[PDB]
Amino acid sequence: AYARTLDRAVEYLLSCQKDEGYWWGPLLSNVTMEAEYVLLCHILDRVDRDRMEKIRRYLLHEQREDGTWALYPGGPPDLDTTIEAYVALKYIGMSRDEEPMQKALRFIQSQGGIESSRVFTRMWLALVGEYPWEKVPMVPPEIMFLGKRMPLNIYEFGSWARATVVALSIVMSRQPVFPLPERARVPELYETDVPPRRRGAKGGGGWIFDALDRALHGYQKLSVHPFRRAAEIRALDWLLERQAGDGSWGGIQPPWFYALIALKILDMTQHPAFIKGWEGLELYGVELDYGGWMFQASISPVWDTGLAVLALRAAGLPADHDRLVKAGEWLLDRQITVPGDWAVKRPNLKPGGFAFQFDNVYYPDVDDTAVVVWALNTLRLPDERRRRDAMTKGFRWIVGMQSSNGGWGAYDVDNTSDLPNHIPFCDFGEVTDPPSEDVTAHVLECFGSFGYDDAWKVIRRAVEYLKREQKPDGSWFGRWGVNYLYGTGAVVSALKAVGIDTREPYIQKALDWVEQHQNPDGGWGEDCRSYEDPAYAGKGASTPSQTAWALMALIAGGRAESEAARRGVQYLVETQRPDGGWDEPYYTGTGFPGDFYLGYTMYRHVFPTLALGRYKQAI
Amino acid sequence: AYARTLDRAVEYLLSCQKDEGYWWGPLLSNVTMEAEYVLLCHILDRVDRDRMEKIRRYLLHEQREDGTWALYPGGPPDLDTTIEAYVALKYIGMSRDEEPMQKALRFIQSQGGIESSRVFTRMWLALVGEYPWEKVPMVPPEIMFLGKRMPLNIYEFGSWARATVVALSIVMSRQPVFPLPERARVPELYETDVPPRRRGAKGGGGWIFDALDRALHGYQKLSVHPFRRAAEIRALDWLLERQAGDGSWGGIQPPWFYALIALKILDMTQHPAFIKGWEGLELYGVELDYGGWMFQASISPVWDTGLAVLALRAAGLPADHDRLVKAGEWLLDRQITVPGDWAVKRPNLKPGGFAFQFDNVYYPDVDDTAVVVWALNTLRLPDERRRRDAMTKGFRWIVGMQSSNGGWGAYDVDNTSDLPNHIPFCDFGEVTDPPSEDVTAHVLECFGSFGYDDAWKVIRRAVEYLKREQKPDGSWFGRWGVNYLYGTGAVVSALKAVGIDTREPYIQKALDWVEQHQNPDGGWGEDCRSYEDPAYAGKGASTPSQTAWALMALIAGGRAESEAARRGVQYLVETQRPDGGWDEPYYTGTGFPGDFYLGYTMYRHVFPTLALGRYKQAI
Ligand SMILES: C=CCN(C)C/C=C/COc1ccc2c(-c3ccc(Br)cc3)coc2c1
Ligand SMILES: C=CCN(C)C/C=C/COc1ccc2c(-c3ccc(Br)cc3)coc2c1
Numbered sequence A, B: 001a002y003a004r005t006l007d008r009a010v011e012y013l014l015s016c017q018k019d020e021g022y023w024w025g026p027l028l029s030n031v032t033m034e035a036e037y038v039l040l041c042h043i044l045d046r047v048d049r050d051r052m053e054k055i056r057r058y059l060l061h062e063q064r065e066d067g068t069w070a071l072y073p074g075g076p077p078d079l080d081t082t083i084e085a086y087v088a089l090k091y092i093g094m095s096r097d098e099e100p101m102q103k104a105l106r107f108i109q110s111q112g113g114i115e116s117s118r119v120f121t122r123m124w125l126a127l128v129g130e131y132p133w134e135k136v137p138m139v140p141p142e143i144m145f146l147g148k149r150m151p152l153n154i155y156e157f158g159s160w161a162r163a164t165v166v167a168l169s170i171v172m173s174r175q176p177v178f179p180l181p182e183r184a185r186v187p188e189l190y191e192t193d194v195p196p197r198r199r200g201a202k203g204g205g206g207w208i209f210d211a212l213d214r215a216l217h218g219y220q221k222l223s224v225h226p227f228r229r230a231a232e233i234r235a236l237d238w239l240l241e242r243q244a245g246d247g248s249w250g251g252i253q254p255p256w257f258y259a260l261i262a263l264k265i266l267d268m269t270q271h272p273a274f275i276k277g278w279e280g281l282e283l284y285g286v287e288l289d290y291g292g293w294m295f296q297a298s299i300s301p302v303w304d305t306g307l308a309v310l311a312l313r314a315a316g317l318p319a320d321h322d323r324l325v326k327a328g329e330w331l332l333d334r335q336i337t338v339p340g341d342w343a344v345k346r347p348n349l350k351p352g353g354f355a356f357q358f359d360n361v362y363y364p365d366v367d368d369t370a371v372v373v374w375a376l377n378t379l380r381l382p383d384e385r386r387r388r389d390a391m392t393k394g395f396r397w398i399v400g401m402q403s404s405n406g407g408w409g410a411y412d413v414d415n416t417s418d419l420p421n422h423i424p425f426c427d428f429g430e431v432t433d434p435p436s437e438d439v440t441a442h443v444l445e446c447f448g449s450f451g452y453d454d455a456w457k458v459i460r461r462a463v464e465y466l467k468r469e470q471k472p473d474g475s476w477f478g479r480w481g482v483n484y485l486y487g488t489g490a491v492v493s494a495l496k497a498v499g500i501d502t503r504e505p506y507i508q509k510a511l512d513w514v515e516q517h518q519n520p521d522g523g524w525g526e527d528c529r530s531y532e533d534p535a536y537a538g539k540g541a542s543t544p545s546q547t548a549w550a551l552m553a554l555i556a557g558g559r560a561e562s563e564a565a566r567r568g569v570q571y572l573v574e575t576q577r578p579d580g581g582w583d584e585p586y587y588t589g590t591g592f593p594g595d596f597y598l599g600y601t602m603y604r605h606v607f608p609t610l611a612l613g614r615y616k617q618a619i
């Protein structure tokens, strides 16, 4: 039956593999990437008329009937995203009249205008002079003086927030303004009567931080700021030391852009670091066949490759298939062997992790490292020496990364401070990197492959963590993947792999929850709204990936030979395309719950293949 | 008569001009450049068999009958240079037997062996483990803590020494060893009976520094060096901030190589600065037609271009010649507009200088700046706006650069400390950058072109400086050009340009000295030995450049219509080649008096043309 579905999915995957031996699907997000890019180009005075064009098609192409842009496809209109896209277009050439500009503007006004947008959005506008800097939450260079163990030192922030904070302190230190031509000024963003509905800090704003900010804005007005000169150079040096190989900073859009702006501010346009950071941008860009151009928030080569392998294996290909060897070899050359920001909390821990992107040595993450190591553990490569060795380093590193609650974060250990969540500046996404169910699950499943079972204390401490984090209805939150279907799929699969008994009560209570959300069409789907409103948990249009996730949960829990089970397999078999792939018009990836969603292009092909590969196993 | 010589020389220079509009002659030095390169490659584990070959041909080709290499062509065998070349060859493949290896080896031994070589040479050997680190003068990272105004803070060193000191403190901090294969070990460098004739610090070694070093090597042995971690990072950041656009450091061989080694030491071979620093090297390399390959100690594009223009103008071409405009435009794009290390002593001084090489913004020098500005002053470019403006900036920068004694240094103001000259480490070349007669002269002649005569206090203070520095016999030392013929030529030409009276006693006493050293063959020549033994001052085989220098001195002093005068013109007119150029098998350039000499490839063509252009003027 499905066997053909598999043979067809397999050959399709293999056809997507690049020459070097890896897989690399693009990463989808929202238009703030390209919108901010346009603005960046203006700040750096490096505008390419042809590029703007391609960007205009894209922005428009992405706008909806109502004239707005959302975070995820088929989602509620987003203010910030729409404001930024609006300004972007007006600068590229559009007139506030044109149909699109019209629809958007009205939606923006019906929301309280610019005064209701996240800090970033107001900050960008502040940068081109369309918003007073005084009203933007202040982050001082002096934050660079806080010690390793102090309230709000930069290492109390998540890796992704950290670099941004550093780069920004330099920018906010100078509060520079790069005026836009009159043709693009957007005063109309204020022209509204609706009351400005301000978004506050993630965890609520104590009156302390409120005061402190006003404080800082006042100090900012003084004529002399002693040691500021030094605080800046401190930040700069911090940035210069960490620049990634591709010229980015962390391989993520934000800090990269801010860092570049900051160098511009410091008259360092013709310094090696600036030049490289600038040229690097192109690698993250993508030519859209309909004429547009988009910029990736980040890139997932390693990750894509890692899952690719595992899927193709669980599928059927030989642990030494010459095409998988190409990948295995490639992966080995990726292993990070030098200290990263994580060493600040683990000085005696030997380097051995992996990054998400191509060349980002200071920020390996547990998730990638776990999947990669495990994927390798399933291959037989020529140099069994290096494979054995690689694995062991990565493994040890993963173990040394385990946090205090027996769980695993993504980039740091016990990056669980609560302080950062209350600053006025932090009103978007996550700011800290605490342990999560999905990463912890992936780790356990990694160790699982090696055989380490529930006996080992490390594994237990972790299971205890998961057991305590389970939800009332028996599901598990999905931190980096939409959502409960993603998490529950992870945990169960993991627990199964570490020897735990699939028959336990809590396990059964999870599998039940799964069968319970199967859509009429036989598959499963969970919409990104499930982060904002619970009624959506496990509810949504069926997708190949999410279906594949629920299947893995079922296959692991023994219910492989179920109705719901065989039912979901049908869905995949039917919905598959002639070429072997699958379609998926919905995002199944999560950047920040409720704030930033991602579309992992390869998910639709790899997870269905891995789920099917594992079903063919249960028989 | 000579008119043809000029026409011929002119069209020749014009044929040497690159497309972009500049001139760029190679820079000759000695084999330690290529020898150190070989070693560098070994340290970085990046050896290209093919390149090694090209370097062997070169090394050999440069060796002399006696089996030694000298600093300047036709000079006494140099120990350090020969030791380094020896080791280089042995590593590339030579056997201690072969004729070349034998002759060299014996010369080395007849000198006390390795124990008689400069610090650098022993250090390089220490790096590959052929010499104990304990016996190498120690320079600690902690030097990074001395304040702006303190004994031996890094800004008390000359720009070229500074960067090296920083990069090295990191290296000496770790005292790393990169072993050579047994095949190349050079124990035989010790096998000698002759007493080791040790070279001491430039200005003498007080017993203090002697003790201090011993102190440091002791502290080096401790198990804990508090804050060293930070001293290193201070150095690292200092380097990271100053890397040049081409990836070099200062556009000079030394620090660039050391910095690269230092990054390697810190596991930063995957960092942008290193990759760029590494790829940058190729630009300084040069394919030799006989199969060899050489590496330039530095590059003189700006300088060459600057003089090229002036010569072609004084010769005759129109101030708006389309071919000179190409140059003028090019030069404008070169002006440095950001703070350099010089700002540490001139914070309120506006940037406006120029560098020697292509892209080296933190180290513009007075010499280049003066020649460039002045050369522009002689042109008529399309955008008279930028020309007017640029000049002004440069001018101001030059003025603000004048030191305490009315003289001008090269890179810094009053970089005249005496402390650095006594450290055990500093046994090679110059370590400080004090004012010199030639630079000061070039500056005066620059201003001179504008009009600013002796009235202006600036000019006077300077003339006073020169007047006091003149030698007993009426000559002027040549700091960056071999030597008295170079300096005296500069000064006199300058003084003439600033309105002074060529008839004065001291002026006449100079011109006389000139006429007095004219060689029988009608030309002038001064050998590089004139830095070690006075009997050589103004003595040596005639060269096109030095002849052209003495001519400018004579033409300026009114004695243009002299015997010696017309006599020297003959020399040039005759010795000139059929193509238009001139030959010059001798170095006329000076890096460090008595320690490092340079061959300016373009000198032989430009100065003769400029001297001839100025003779055609006196009629
Ligand atoms: C899929 C598995 C998740 N696991 C953990 C691997 C790591 C993935 C990379 O995680 C991120 C995490 C954050 C980001 C951002 C981003 C976007 C906007 C802001 Br504001 C800040 C960061 C852009 O790309 C990102 C990628
Ligand atoms: C011709 C005019 C001189 N004027 C002033 C312009 C500046 C020229 C650059 O001066 C230098 C000055 C020093 C160096 C070194 C060098 C070589 C060995 C060591 Br050790 C240290 C530096 C290599 O190249 C150099 C070039």
Ligand SMILES: CCCCCCCCOCCOCCOCCOCCO
Pocket (backbone or CB within 6 Å): A241, A242, A339, A340, A341, A342, A343, A344, A362, B229, B232, B233, B266, B268
């Ligand atoms: C000069 C110290 C070299 C020793 C490196 C250990 C650094 C420990 O990391 C602590 C914080 O820095 C995070 C890592 O990325 C650092 C890059 O800087 C490179 C070498 O200092």
Ligand SMILES: CCCCCCCCOCCOCCOCCOCCO
Pocket (backbone or CB within 6 Å): A229, A232, A233, A236, A266, B241, B242, B339, B340, B341, B342, B343, B344, B362
């Ligand atoms: C963050 C301060 C930036 C202002 C620096 C100017 C300081 C005065 O110059 C001191 C000497 O250092 C030379 C500066 O240029 C080198 C690179 O350092 C980068 C920031 O300017």
